[PDB]
Enzyme design. Sequence first.
Site, PDB file in Angstrom:
ATOM      1  CB  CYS F  33      -1.282  15.313  -7.613  1.00 33.75           C
ATOM      2  SG  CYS F  33       0.175  14.506  -6.949  1.00 33.75           S
ATOM      3  CB  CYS F  36      -0.726  11.635  -7.118  1.00 32.81           C
ATOM      4  SG  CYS F  36      -0.608  12.956  -5.900  1.00 32.81           S
TER       5      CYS F  36
END
Lengths: 271, 318, 81, 63, 398, 110, 48, 272, 37
Positions: F33, F36
């Site tokens: 991700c 993230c």
Amino acid sequence: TRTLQWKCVESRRDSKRLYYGRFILSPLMKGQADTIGIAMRRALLGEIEGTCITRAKFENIPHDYSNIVGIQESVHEILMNLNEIVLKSNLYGTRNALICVQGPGYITARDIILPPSVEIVDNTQHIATLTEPINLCIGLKIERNRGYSLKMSNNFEDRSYPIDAVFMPVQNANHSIHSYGNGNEKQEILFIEIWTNGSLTPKEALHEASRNLINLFIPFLHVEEETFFQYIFIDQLELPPRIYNCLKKSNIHTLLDLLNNSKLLDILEKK
Amino acid sequence: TRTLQWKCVESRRDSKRLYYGRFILSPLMKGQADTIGIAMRRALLGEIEGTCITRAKFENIPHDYSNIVGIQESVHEILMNLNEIVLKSNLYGTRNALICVQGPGYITARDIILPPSVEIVDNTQHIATLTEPINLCIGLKIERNRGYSLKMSNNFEDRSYPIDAVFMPVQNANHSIHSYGNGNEKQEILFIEIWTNGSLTPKEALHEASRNLINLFIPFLHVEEETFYLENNQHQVTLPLFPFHNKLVNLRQKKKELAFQYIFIDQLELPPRIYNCLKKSNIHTLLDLLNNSQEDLIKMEHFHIEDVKKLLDILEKK
Amino acid sequence: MTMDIERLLLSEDNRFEFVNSVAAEATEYVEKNRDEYGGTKKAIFHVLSNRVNDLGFDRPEAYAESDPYKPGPGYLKEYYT
Amino acid sequence: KVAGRHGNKGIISKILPRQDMPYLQDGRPVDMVFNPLGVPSRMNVGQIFECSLGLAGSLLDRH
Amino acid sequence: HESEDISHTYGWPPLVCCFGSAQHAFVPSGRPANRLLDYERQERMKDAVWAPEKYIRAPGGCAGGVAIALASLGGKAAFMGKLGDDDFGQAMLYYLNVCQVQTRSVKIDSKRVTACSTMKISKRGRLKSTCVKPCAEDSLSKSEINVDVLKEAKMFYFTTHSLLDKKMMSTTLQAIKISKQLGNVIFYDLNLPLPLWQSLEETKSLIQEVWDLADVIEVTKQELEFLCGIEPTEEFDTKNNDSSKFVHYEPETVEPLWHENLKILFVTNGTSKIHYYTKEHNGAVLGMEDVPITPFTRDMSASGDGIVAGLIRMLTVQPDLMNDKGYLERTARYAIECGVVDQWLLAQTRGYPPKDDSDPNGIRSITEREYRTSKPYDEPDGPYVMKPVEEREYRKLE
Amino acid sequence: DYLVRKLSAQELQDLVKGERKVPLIVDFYATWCGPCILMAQELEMLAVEYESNAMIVKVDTDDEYEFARDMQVRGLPTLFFISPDPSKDAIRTEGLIPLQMMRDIIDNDM
Amino acid sequence: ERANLVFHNKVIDGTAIKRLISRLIDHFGMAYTSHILDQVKTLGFQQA
Amino acid sequence: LSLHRCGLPREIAIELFQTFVIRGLIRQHLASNIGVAKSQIREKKPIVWEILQEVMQGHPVLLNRAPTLHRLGIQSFQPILVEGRTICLHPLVCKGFNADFDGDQMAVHVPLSLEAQAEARLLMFSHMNLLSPAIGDPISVPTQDMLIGLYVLTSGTRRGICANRYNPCEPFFCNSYDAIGAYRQKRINLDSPLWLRWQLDQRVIASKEVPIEVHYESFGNYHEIYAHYLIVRSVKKETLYIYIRTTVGHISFYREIEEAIQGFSQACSYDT
Amino acid sequence: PYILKLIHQVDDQRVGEMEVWALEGFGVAHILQEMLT
Ligand SMILES: [Ca+2]
């Protein structure tokens, strides 16, 4: 210190069919501004899709003369007025537009029945002037092509008069380079100057030219799927006279000339 | 499978430092080959970085025009030999290299101690000839850059004699445009032939030019400058939303209320017809709406006199 | 300014008197304000701009123009010869 | 000041990058661009002969 | 309940209603994927081009991200959703407005808080989470639906993230029925959320009542296999562009998911390849995915938003050419180019995380040039730096 | 010192089932991700700012996929704010939230 | 305001351009013609 | 360069404007006195060049050819700071100076007194001396390749047997902008014939000759085909349509003059 | 062609009497005085 950013410095709209826009791109390293300006100018002039009328069918009019009753303008002048109509569209392929009107009055671009995806930039454009109370139906042919493209098919000949339409939505484009030095910091500033006929704003033409340019160089990054002895001559080597003459007739002088063309080999292979 | 295909129709390796590659791109609609050809022409010739020696540092010589005992070449001959070698490296920055050796013998490019970033292309390139067993050590600077090194004095350092490096790796490029003879949309065939000094194959140079070109036209697809809010100091925010959020929290702490230039007519509960007309007139912000006049609103197409009255009282409630 | 210079001469009787009058008025300007006509503003250009403005037209003061696209204080616009 | 051997003297006014100099059909950009108007007025056609023969000599590797 | 016929003021291009949430940077899930890549270039560019160890592609972003992407393409996009009347909600609301996205359909709530839903953490048996207070972009009500926006819009867009809350689901179904009644084409980008990738049976039941209402459905290749039950047999992260990893499924495999209302099904493998299926025509378009990617943009969510934005852009302008093979080939190719551009833009915007040997929200990034800058290797003990005569160790020549 | 510590699901149960003196922040992240990774950098300095006054814990959803589904983690990046007092409810934030909001979420409102 | 020039259609040469400059000076003045010369100079250089 | 401008190198400009640069440094407090400024100039600070750039702005200089030839052998130009170590000069004024480019060196003088600067700008500038006093003829007439380029532009279509292989026994453009635009898009050549829909009055200079052929239709419309243009008149109406048969080159040359006039008029907007 | 580089830039003021005539022709009396001052 800075990042490569662009901005619109000038934006004028002194017409319904004449838009002006000036854009700045900076900072640029030496030599890059000319490359960007040259390619962008080519994209703006021809690579941008433009929409305009290509053919005109005079329905219900079998006169086939240069002029028709009730209309002041000649048939040739009506085509000239149609060629000046500025259109914006997203159509794919070709569509049909219709101009069926009443008797006396002025035929303008507002009177054109349009296909769903097209628009009239300036509805005040004059098409023809009507004097006698006679209805007039015109069958237009709306097409969307690039400036650089060429088309050869012209509906053969079925009383449809072709219109030699230029597909430039960007009337003019120009680029300028400003170079600034700080002793050893040679940065370049690129100015893009765009004139459009109102079918798209100069800011939009800047984006479309940039996207069209990118779409041209994307294919170079494409990948495909995978599936799982001049100094020796024929004279020296002993050859039959029949074979020797045949080779000599074909300008086969050395051995390289012999292998470049494809019991001759049996005798040759040993030497 | 793709309708528009490209292929390397001929690749050649004439020498260690002269690679030839010819590429075809077909079919291209009329005018695209001309646009691609010139842009590829300029990108290949002057938009591809190369790496080469920038300056060399000797120890015991007074100047770059003296003679070293045991070397068959003058110091100026050595610098030209160093200027001729070809290096490949995908990384930027100035890097060090060493030619610390002893003779007698031939000093070649293979004798250069290179950092892991850079690689030697032609290890057989001659540099110097040693006739007697002397100990020769040369300090090198390797840099990747565009164009060519500036031919001006920069030898204020510890006797590092500058080398007029030419970073351009594409020796020559050419392109030809041929008619496809389709007769229905005027398709064309584009050929591109690239000559490189071996630091990168012509196929790599073809890709690098295309990627460099995209990075030149991609800025116009970025958002326009001064569109999002910023503290007018960083000028480069990874997340454009955060600098405006930092404004609101400071604004809320000071209780100063948001400015009119940041209040859009969307939040104003306008009738749908009123909203559409204002958007059509390129009026998006409340501040832009206020700067207009009632007469400036009546002249709009689907705008009437009764509407400017109901528009005002909506603003009055706010 | 070139068009403005000619425009002033159109209403003049002798171009040698015009330059003398301009020089005389320019000298008067610099005497009053020594620390104004040294750089971006020139004494003579200020006279010409004023004389055009006296006719009822509009011109920038001393025809002085800045560079809105100048990146930094140390960056001076190199001229493409 | 650059000059040929046929009295075609010349001052250098511009230095351009190789990518915007005019280039031949083999893609090589020219190194120097001369004014063709010099020949008719000065009437030195020897440079025209030398120019063409120099190209042939370099390609054929001859002097 | 209706109003005057205001259709005369609707301006081209037709409005698109991007219904859903307005998350800032929020990916639904991520599945292993195969990228059409030139691995010979990667081998020689490994020291300057960052490549993830495992290539995992997200289906896209939120519905607001599509509206932003669609607006940047010149289309007219309106976002329908709910935002809180707090610092983040107004910041997000400003972000949509400055991105030319119409927000007259955005309901601003003072009671709710943006993206801060309260949770009740059970810890008696196995710990769970129940939503005591839905976040601001989960409390949209059926009354808080701008029908006038739906009347103007000729295409309705929504994602599966709007079906994860019952209150959202009822409103989402209500909006679609109104749009269907108003003659608006329903676009359903799947973008399967993280919890739905387990227990396939509940996922089918969750979206079955809404699958039949969508005229156009865009699903990823991984999502299509999950719905069809196909097990992924191809290898992953293998340095080859094998045709098995990019396989065009036959229409027979697509038939179980088909229904009468469905007109086009888009199967996207990223920007590498996009597959389109209709009643008569089916095909695929190859693209490229060797775009610059940084650790901040490795999820490929921008490509997902760009691809659907390009699909919406092409379908809205020519609604009558949806069942046209030639136009679908151009539409899918156009979507690929939009996805490529958006991913390319994102890499330059976000940059790279700093290397390993002054910011309100602590975020350190470097540009591509700084990421490709090499260490000088000027260590005095290093073999690449001149040393005193004592330790020169002069190598002998031939 | 103090930083974001990698914990698994069973490493988070006793944390929430047991005692919590300072607020506990659960970072549901995945290496694939993009946002993230940005979310981590904010938590890197948020942990520095709040030092021992708060606790930061990251949980990988790729491994703890069954546990994230139970937590109703609808996507990434997702942050869970756990009050030290078990009486008060938790706060789940979805999306790349700004640093300032995390300040007020843990100092007050929890 | 449209300028009432004359549409030269056949050809212009050294004598033709010299006459045109003379007429432009006698009609528009030297300030206009100085700018016209620069545009003409650029046009001639560009097309050459 | 413009007709009234000249380029000066940095090392030459600083020598000529030594005093004025020092004044600028003292005026703006960069240098406390003369001694600091002179040392600062030798230091070649970046501020010095910025001061020099603004100092020369508006201060004319006199360019003199040592083997002086005409009254134009000495003339005044507005200097602009240019790169390199050579004096750039306008191509047109190099004919007034007979400035061959096989080698030439000019002497440049900077007027100091305000009276001298006044008459340099108002009496000796190139934009006010365009007519030779000998007979009253222009001096800055385009020459060399400037004249070649214009000649090629106005060298129109091939006519007669040079255009058609056999005895006969073309695009229509509604306005000049389309004709120029089509030429840019490579649709037509520079010398390719075309018909331009003329909206103004009869303006082209052609030999006064009767129409080659008049196509008189039975409905009252009659076309008059001249050697260079077509005129469509009518009996019922008074339309008076005019189509000019010309090239892009003639249009480009005509448009260049017209745009130059309009561009100069808009810049010197006395109307506002 | 074979092109040589010349020596002028390697190897290497007074107002003459004719420039006075040209200045007088322009009538720049103050400039003419400035030369002789
Ligand atoms: Ca998707």
